[PDB]
Amino acid sequence: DTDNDNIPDSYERNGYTIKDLIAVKWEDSFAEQGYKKYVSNYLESNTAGDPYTDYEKASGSFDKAIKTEARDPLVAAYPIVGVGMEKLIISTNEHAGLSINKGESAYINANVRYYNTGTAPMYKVTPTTNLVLDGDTLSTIKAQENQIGNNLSPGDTYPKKGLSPLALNTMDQFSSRLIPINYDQLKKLDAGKQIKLETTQVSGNFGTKNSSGQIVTEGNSWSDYISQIDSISASIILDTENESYERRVTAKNLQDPEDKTPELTIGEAIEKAFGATKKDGLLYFNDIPIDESCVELIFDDNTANKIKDSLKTLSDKKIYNVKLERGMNILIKTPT
Amino acid sequence: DTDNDNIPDSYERNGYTIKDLIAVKWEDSFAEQGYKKYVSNYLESNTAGDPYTDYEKASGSFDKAIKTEARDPLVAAYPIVGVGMEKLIISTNEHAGLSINKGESAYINANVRYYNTGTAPMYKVTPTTNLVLDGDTLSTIKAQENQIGNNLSPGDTYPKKGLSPLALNTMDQFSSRLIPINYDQLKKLDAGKQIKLETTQVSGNFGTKNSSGQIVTEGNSWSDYISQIDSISASIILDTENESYERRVTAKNLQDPEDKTPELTIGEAIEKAFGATKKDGLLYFNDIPIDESCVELIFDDNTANKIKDSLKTLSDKKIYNVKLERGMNILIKTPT
Amino acid sequence: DTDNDNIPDSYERNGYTIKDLIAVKWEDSFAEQGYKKYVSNYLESNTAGDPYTDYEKASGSFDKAIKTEARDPLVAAYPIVGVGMEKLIISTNEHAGLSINKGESAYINANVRYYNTGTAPMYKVTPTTNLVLDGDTLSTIKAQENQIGNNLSPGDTYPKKGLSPLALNTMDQFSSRLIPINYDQLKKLDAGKQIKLETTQVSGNFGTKNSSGQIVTEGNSWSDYISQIDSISASIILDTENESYERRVTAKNLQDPEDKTPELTIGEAIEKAFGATKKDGLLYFNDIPIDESCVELIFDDNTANKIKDSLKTLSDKKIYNVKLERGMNILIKTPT
Amino acid sequence: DTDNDNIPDSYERNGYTIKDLIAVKWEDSFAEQGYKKYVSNYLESNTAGDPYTDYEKASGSFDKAIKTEARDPLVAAYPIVGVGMEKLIISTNEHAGLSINKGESAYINANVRYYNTGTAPMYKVTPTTNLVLDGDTLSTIKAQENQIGNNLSPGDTYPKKGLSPLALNTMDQFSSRLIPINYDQLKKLDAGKQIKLETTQVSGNFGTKNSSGQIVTEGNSWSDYISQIDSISASIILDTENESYERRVTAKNLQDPEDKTPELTIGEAIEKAFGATKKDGLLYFNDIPIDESCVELIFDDNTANKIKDSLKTLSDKKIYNVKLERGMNILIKTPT
Amino acid sequence: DTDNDNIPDSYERNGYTIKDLIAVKWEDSFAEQGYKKYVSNYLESNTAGDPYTDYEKASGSFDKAIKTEARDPLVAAYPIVGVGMEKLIISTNEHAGLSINKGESAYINANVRYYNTGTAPMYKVTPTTNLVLDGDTLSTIKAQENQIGNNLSPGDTYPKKGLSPLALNTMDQFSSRLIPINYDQLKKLDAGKQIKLETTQVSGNFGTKNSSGQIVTEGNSWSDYISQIDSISASIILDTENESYERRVTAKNLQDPEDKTPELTIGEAIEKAFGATKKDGLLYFNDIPIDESCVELIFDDNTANKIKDSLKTLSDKKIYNVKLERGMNILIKTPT
Amino acid sequence: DTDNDNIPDSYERNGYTIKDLIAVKWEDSFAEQGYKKYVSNYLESNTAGDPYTDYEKASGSFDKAIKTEARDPLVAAYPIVGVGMEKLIISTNEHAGLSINKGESAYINANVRYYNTGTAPMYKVTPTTNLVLDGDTLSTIKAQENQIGNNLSPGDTYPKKGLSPLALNTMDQFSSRLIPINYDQLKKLDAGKQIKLETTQVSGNFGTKNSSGQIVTEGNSWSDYISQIDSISASIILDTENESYERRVTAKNLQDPEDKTPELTIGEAIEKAFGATKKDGLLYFNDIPIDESCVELIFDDNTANKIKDSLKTLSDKKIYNVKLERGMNILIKTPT
Ligand SMILES: [Ca+2]
Ligand SMILES: [Ca+2]
Ligand SMILES: [Ca+2]
Ligand SMILES: [Ca+2]
Ligand SMILES: [Ca+2]
Ligand SMILES: [Ca+2]
Ligand SMILES: [Ca+2]
Ligand SMILES: [Ca+2]
Ligand SMILES: [Ca+2]
Ligand SMILES: [Ca+2]
Ligand SMILES: [Ca+2]
Ligand SMILES: [Ca+2]
């Protein structure tokens, strides 16, 4: 036990299961009772880089809002949130003779909705959105106390279904100083074009247990864990044309000989990340099969190049048999 | 005693009662003295996810404002509060020749009343209400120091009966910067329509004991416990046409084999949650029977589908004999 | 000694007296020296819910401003404060041609006086008062640093006799942003009606001893103890047509078999709460008798219903012999 | 072990390798498995001046976003960030007769993008940029809460590729007080010239491990480590005409006899800093050779003078065989 | 070892050297290897008054930005910083008929550059500069967050070479309230004269080691160490017509018999402070000799009087053989 | 050793000297080596009331900016600072038709210089100055962050010689809200009179040693030590027509029999406070004799009355032989 996470090294290498809050060896008969087999590394406290260790992830005492796909030590608990924008309303600043003040000529108010995907929940969201109009960033606004939405659960929005979206109209750190806009930009957008909004960063905390049996949120942050997770993991995004899922799977650096991380191919990583039931050698998700022939796979330039290099020296010419290295981005689009 | 909550595992599995602040086994003769039988899990400190453990809930030393229905370890102590709005008054901003300034053309002041349902009290309420007019969110306001109402007890309002409702007219973090509204929206609402208000989130603390014998409120929060409770519990709401009650009951995930949570049907969950006296095999609440034939039951699409699947393989065709799984939403409307 | 408040259980059940800072048994000869007999429960540190325990209350080391009626462990130390309003003065905002600005058309300044009743003193009062005019809450103002009055003793006002009342004219968290009022409301109140003011909540601290021999105020609060006291106690208010007294007496829940609280009738609760000398079987207060025949008793609907149910099965038909349960509200008006 | 960094002095002098989190001696057969040989000093906890020690750097437990070139104890982990500016937009402040207010005659809004080079990431960037126009510093602005960009990873920008740049338009500590500009400067820049922007300083924190197994960011700073690193290290910057790299390598002061730092020439420092594979005695980077003949080397006056003094007494007349002393600045431009 | 700085008293009196982080006696053969001989006092932890002790100064573990001349325990580590001002630009506040508002009639913006001399660096500079015009202090401004420059290294400026100077235009604690100026002063300075700026005080922290192996800056200050150093030390300033150097050397009070400080003449103090190589009995600095005949020496009235008293009773009539007492100010100007 | 300040009671009563940081008995031969004899009390930690004890004062480890006259335990270390005012400049607030706004009709800016006398330095001065004009206090201003001058050494000013005085023009807690003045006061002072300024109180900290070997300033204050020192000490002020000195000497209350303080006459107190060399039985200061015949002595009414009572029963009719009691104020003016 070099890593000191109450898991033996042989257990962490050859497979283990958590039963009655203790680790036991893996046998083939354990799969009939609903158990799972986990493989991790014996030189690190947390394999995936998330703030929970291997034993906390495998036992399932991190939280009760984190999905069961993040119980695997090789799958990182990481929320990916975004902002959906609509209904930009313009307030005229003319004084009634008339008085067309320039510089501060109108005001803009937007309706936003925060959406979360992934596994973990964000307990205090604070997105930073910038407004783009005709290739010109008008402003960059970080959410104030009126726009901070606590306990954004995974899979649902902060303004829930059946509720009107949030309003964003202020710029100051406190709720004052409404967003101004030039007269030239006002006359430009009144003719033909619209204003788009995009997110840049989101800051949020996570819940951790205390020594008194309670959980605590304030003091933690996700901003110091994004840089660690994104550099050692590959990103797989699946679209079912009605919902979307984004997952990060840990990979092994082949050049480093001190990285005793288990090696996963594309198919095993997909099965352990998204959550699927294997039947007749075919992944099936809930009902929709996600094999290579049935669905469409979208890569990047580097991912396609790496797959092309790793496909020339394979006995079996399948995409899912290619070794998964860090930095890959995979998109899986199911047929309609 | 794996969970370390001074309750033995056999006691926690086969039923137990708290007498003289110690746990004892359950016998059939204990029901004649007014005692209750509790079943919990032996692998978790708190079964329902509320910040009080099984022993604290069963003994009854959490607080003296929490209802006796939350003494059961399977019933979570969770307040559900809301905002009732009335009497939106409009202040004209015309200067008297006239001067109709646009952008900031009028002001709105609303009267609000905070209502609490459930079991636990919220010790420092801070609701976040947004105003909707013609499908357009005008503003989203979080309550300031003048609108924060401490010690909102369960079953009653923060402005008590015989008192005028609270006033909401400010937008800034401090008490300044009255709510503006466009001239177009002013002329729109002056003709035919009205302004609605809805709640989005409420943040509040809870009282916990200290090592000095006193209780402490500041430092705790409810926002980190909503996401844990709502993902592992089912929600039952009962209407008596004059008051409403909302309760959350813990359920068991069948796929997870490490969840040693007791299994409850619909009838047992209703009886242990709302509080009822069983007579001739019929639940009776206070006086009004709440059996399946007498009252009306309202489900959702997923709840009705799950009940339809679980009803085809039952020897007795009754709704209350269906196993209760997580995610169900049940509404019970009594006849008038 | 289960409760661990250095009081034995038999002493706490059969009666005890504190002499030389230690507890001794009660004899009939102790009443001739001016001693009192106390009964409490042996399963709780503090019976009445106030932040002082049974031994602290019985010995008399809580404070020296708390009344001797709160020395009894069954009587809670709880201040009830209120605001008396007068002399609303209106400031015109017309600019002299004239200029009648709407929205912010005048200002209001009120004179307030904080009054305290009960036993304990409030060490830092901060009342929250709302102004009602023609059934319309104009504003809700929480007292700022200029309106916070420390060490409000029981039985007297914060602006003492011979001093002009406090002034309330600001709305902002700091001393700025004077209270505005519409032109319509100004012309409405200038004709026939007046503006009333009511209190909604008051936040205040209490003094507790430290380990260094000093007392400390900042850090404590009364807002977390109102919800506990008001749910387990009955309220008795006595009027002598010149002063008023409000007291809370602890009661026993009959359905709960783990509540080992002593049972008190109406007469014993009145005698132990308000403070009276028994002579010829008649309570006498200071000089004015407060028996059922001499004075007038006012109940509520629930209190009268409970008394009617509990009066049909009594051998002696007297009001003071009825068992006192929680939730009762009693008013005692002495004849003039 | 004088320095107390669990590394023996003979190990730290003659070469060592970290295997299974313990230090072992270096043999020639270890290079075939992918291992590296490290040399450090035995009188200091951290040789390069970065906040991580020799054992933390050599083992590789500092962070997972730091590049593998900073695993060497002689290479300092140090981010170098900068600001790229574009799209200065001017807002007129004329009131429409006209009204040309002087002093505050227009406003300027800039679009900025933060770029990071080096090894370590900056976890909370706060650049300080000043605007120069016609040799006149108009203003110096430090980034506010809307312009602070957390977790700026090495090798990429804070507004990532495919996103519009950040907006800078405020001057006050809070988001208010837009940037003013004189009428003379407005008429000066409207004719022929443009406004440039430059960075002056950047403040940022770094992530360090805690005793609870988590990492912490707030409390640390980079501003107290720049002065230590820059005085004892030489700077080498390499340009590949599409990306740039900047590295700092520790050097030895020859006059100080208590500096037991290993001596490195130019070639060894380049190979250990930038990261290169030696083949046939030639450095090759990724594919592009970076030998003295193939690429162009740019020095300063002091660097060229020191190389000229150290080149007259060399048996082999090569640039890479010159001893590297502190204060040198080297630029390596690859051919196109 | 009375002073408890792990240095023996005989070692501290007769000379010592730090080798392998331990103190050893001084021999004449140690000068051939590059070692130095130090003399200090045995009754004080730090002889010079700087926040580093004798052992920390002699070993060289204080910091790596402090010059090697401050390694001597008799030379205090003390930065002397100043502000160089240029390019005062005037902003007219006339409104265009015209409108010449008095009191606030124009604005002034200055360009400043912070320069550091001495040994230690200032880690957070905050200079306090006042503006003088025609013998009238217009304003006194302390630098805000936009004008605070961290890690000002010794020997170089905060806006480095090749960068435009810092801008100073605000007066408020936050970045607001631009500097006003009277119309009389505006018309006075527009005719013939200019505005000068001078520094009054500078506040800055210093870096010290922690128990966790890191260094910490916030919490320390230089303002409590200026008064101690300046009262017990003499100041020597040397000018080479292109750079300037300022040093403080500790002196001994002759009247106090409990001051066991070593006695230094002018020549030994100059050699140990500025740093010089002795050759043929002549100081030589880098190359320029700084003997009494070659260069010009400038004193004050008190310094010249003390030298005149101490020169009448000397066997050898040289300036450098005069005993150096506290309070002396010496200027050394090299020939051009 | 009752007082526990590592000084024996017989040593503290019969005289003692601090040599090699330990206390030794006094002999007549110790005066030839430059030593001093100290007498203190054995029932108090600090005799004079200053925050340094008897051993700290006698040894000389308090600070290095405190004068040697405060090394005596009977002389309190106490700075007396003041403000010298000049150059009140008036800014007109007329708008140019004209516009003479009343209430806020002009502005005043003063030039101030802080001077320190006594022994100890004030490390963060914050004087509170009020402006008097025609017997009317215009305003009372406490110094803000721009006017706070750290490390005010004894004997010199905060704006040193050769520097322009500080500017005072603001009134708000932050640097805003310039000082207004009425039109009536403006026309009153423009004719014949001037505005005077006086100090009322000054708040400042002092430096004390820490357990880590450093000194700390923030957290201490002088405001809690003025009331203790001024009630038990007599004040002697000496004028040499070019500088002034103010000292406080501890006295003994004759009525209290528990005050074991040594008794001092006027001459011994003057010699031990101001610092003088006794020659031929005559005090001589530096060169100017300060005997009763040569210089002029100025008392108050109470001081002259006490001297008249204590002079009738003296064998030798000299002023310096009168016992010095607390509350006396003595002024010593040397001839010109
Ligand atoms: Ca392990
Ligand atoms: Ca592990
Ligand atoms: Ca248990
Ligand atoms: Ca349990
Ligand atoms: Ca007890
Ligand atoms: Ca008790
Ligand atoms: Ca070592
Ligand atoms: Ca080392
Ligand atoms: Ca020593
Ligand atoms: Ca020493
Ligand atoms: Ca003593
Ligand atoms: Ca003493």
Residue numbers in the entry:
A (entry chain A), B (entry chain G), C (entry chain F), D (entry chain B), E (entry chain C), F (entry chain D): 220 to 315, 378 to 617
From the publication, what sentences describe this entry?
All three B subunits are presumed to contain five domains that are involved in regulation (D1), oligomerization (D2 and D3), and host recognition (D3’ and D4). Once proteolyzed, the mature form of CDTb forms a large heptameric, soluble structure referred to as the prepore which binds one molecule of CDTa to generate the toxic moiety, CDT.
Still, maps of modest global resolution could be reconstructed for the CDTb dimer (3.74 Å), trimer (4.08 Å), tetramer (4.08 Å), and symmetric heptamer (3.27 Å) which enabled map refinement and model construction. Similarly, the number of symmetric particles in this dataset were not equal, with the heptameric structure ~44-fold more abundant than the octameric form. Although the unique pathway we describe for CDT also results in the formation of heptameric and octameric structures, the octameric structures are present at a significantly lower abundance in vitro when compared to that observed for anthrax toxin in a cellular model (~1.5% and ~30% in CDT and anthrax toxin, respectively). Conversely, the particles isolated in fraction five retained a high molecular weight, suggesting the symmetric heptamer does not spontaneously disassemble upon dilution. Indeed, residues 456–463 of CDTb remain unengaged and dynamic in the structures we describe here but interface in the symmetric heptamer. Our observation that small oligomeric intermediates, but not the assembled symmetric structures, spontaneously assemble and disassemble would support this hypothesis.
